[PDB]
Amino acid sequence: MGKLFGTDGVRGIVNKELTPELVLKLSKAIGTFFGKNSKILVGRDVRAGGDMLVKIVEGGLLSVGVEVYDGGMAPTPALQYAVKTLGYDGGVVITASHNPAPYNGIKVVDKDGIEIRREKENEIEDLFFTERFNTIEWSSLTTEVKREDRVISTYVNGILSHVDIEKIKKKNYKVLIDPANSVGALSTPLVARALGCKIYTINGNLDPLFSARQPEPTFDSLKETAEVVKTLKVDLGVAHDGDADRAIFIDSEGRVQWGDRSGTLLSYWASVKNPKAIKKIVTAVSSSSLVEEYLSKYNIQVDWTKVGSVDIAHKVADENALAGFEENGGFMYPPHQYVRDGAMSFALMLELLANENVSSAELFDRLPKYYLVKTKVDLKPGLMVEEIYKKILEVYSTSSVKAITIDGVKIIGKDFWFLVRKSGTEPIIRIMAEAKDENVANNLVNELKKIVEGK
């Protein structure tokens, strides 16, 4: 996805592109990177190459003198939380995030609990290619991998430590949880149980085949669970992705809400819990401007940024922000941790919902309503994306609106906004735009499509 590393680690179809041989090499590199005698926690989500890959990684880390720990299956926020507060020097999670079932990959989390910074991906990448590995002598190759049984338990308690457990327990909520046949079923339901809810889970059994739906929660994949949400009259529903670092909700009406709608509501509650903290949150240009509208009437500035969760986690930390979030679910609550944490989100939601004494459906309605229209258009050869940018910019900019070119080109105007961004995976430019008036949005997309087409 680069030389190795993509947007969220190294990944590929298991036993084909992501082969045991590659992971074995990537492991000597990661191990050499952390150093001899470093304590590294290894965990995994539910995916297809699960066991095979954990054995390869462990074998790889021993060859380079790492003191290896096995944390079994768990949400990534959970594994990360473990390395963050349990003393580890870092960790490596076997996961392909949201990718379809045949994928799997390697995420590497640094000393702080967040995935390694990019400059570090390069160090590992260099080590991998130059093969400079701290391979150790036979006589010091005498260690067994140890077991780590505190990750889930430590995680849940950590999460529970930030919400009024009794207040919520009192509301005795009726919730539905869609862990997508994965690792999220080992913890979100546990947090629900502590907040005393009646719990219904769809796809709560572990199945690396993801038969019921794609692991990535989208209006399309949630289509059917949104149904059962309604048919079961639940007060709130929550869906996760493969390693549960994401959380998109479904209210009492049985309608799914997008990551930035709930990120905004959650970004709000975070200020209520910390008047002392710098009213200010971070979010990617992929997020609806609706966030500014709503957080504005609370003095919470929204710091726009590039697309990418790892980066956000760092920016939130680096600027001691209130919180951070992506439009795709995944919200960062600093007091807990800087990374996206689905269960953490589900818990905060039940709090916010509990203290407002309003239904999920109503709660969400308190937000600005915008209509989204998106599209993909191929990048014609002999046409540079920098030229498209230059154009739409000098045609849509105006002292009326405001432009953000930290990643592609985002334009924000009264009751409408858009983002034209170059894909890094496909030779395509994504065009998304929404407005309080569905027609000015559709129209917007059309105009943009033209310009992107080099007219």
Angle at the Cα of 335 (from 331 to 341), degrees rounded to 5? Answer: 30
Q: What is the DSSP letter of 199?
A: E
In one-letter notation, the amino acid at residue 18 is L
Instruction: Annotate 318-377 with three-state secondary structure.
Output: HCCCCEEEECCEEEEECCCECCCCHHHHHHHHHHHHHHHCCCHHHHHHCCCCCEEEEEEE
For residue 121, give the nearest of 232, 233, 9, 260 by alpha carbon.
Answer: 9
CB atoms within 10 A of CB 375: 15
Angle at the Cα of 16 (from 13 to 21), degrees rounded to 5? Answer: 110
- Joined together, the tokens standing for residue 136 give 């150790």
Give alpha helix (H) positions in 35-117: 50-63, 76-85
For CA atoms 431, 437, 442, 448, give the dihedral sign: negative
Domains of the chain are 1-150 (3.40.120.10), 151-254+341-358 (3.40.120.10), 255-340+359-370 (3.40.120.10), 371-455 (3.30.310.50)
Residues 91/259, Cβ–Cβ less than 8 Å: no
- Edge-to-edge order in the sheet of strand 280-284: 301-305, 280-284, 323-326, 329-332
- Joined together, the tokens standing for residue 3 give 């030389």
The residue count for the chain? 455
Residues 254/229, Cβ–Cβ less than 8 Å: yes
- Joined together, the tokens standing for residue 45 give 């989500």
Angle at the Cα of 103 (from 97 to 104), degrees rounded to 5? Answer: 60
Is 287 catalytic? The answer is no
Residues of the binding site for Mg(2+): 97, 241, 243, 245
For residue 229, give the nearest of 361, 348, 98, 356 by alpha carbon.
Answer: 361
| 130 class by beta-carbon count within 10 Å (0-12 exposed, 13-18 middle, 19+ buried) | exposed
Give CA–CA dist 261/267, Å, rounded.
10
Residues of the binding site: 97, 241, 243, 245
Main-chain dihedrals φ then ψ at residue 211, nearest 5 degrees: -45, -50
Resolution (A): 2.8
Helices vs. strands in the chain: H and E counts, helices first: 15, 19
Q: What is the DSSP letter of 65?
A: T
Q: Per the residue annotation, which of 97, 287, 309, 360 is the catalytic one?
A: 97
**Beta carbons within 8 Å of 446's beta carbon, 6+ residues apart:** none
Q: What is the dihedral of CA 18, 22, 23, 29, to 10 degrees?
A: -140
Residues 429/377, Cβ–Cβ less than 8 Å: yes
| 83, 272, 324, 437 from 341: Cα distances, Å | 15, 19, 11, 33
Give CA–CA dist 288/302, Å, rounded.
11
Give CA–CA dist 289/369, Å, rounded.
11
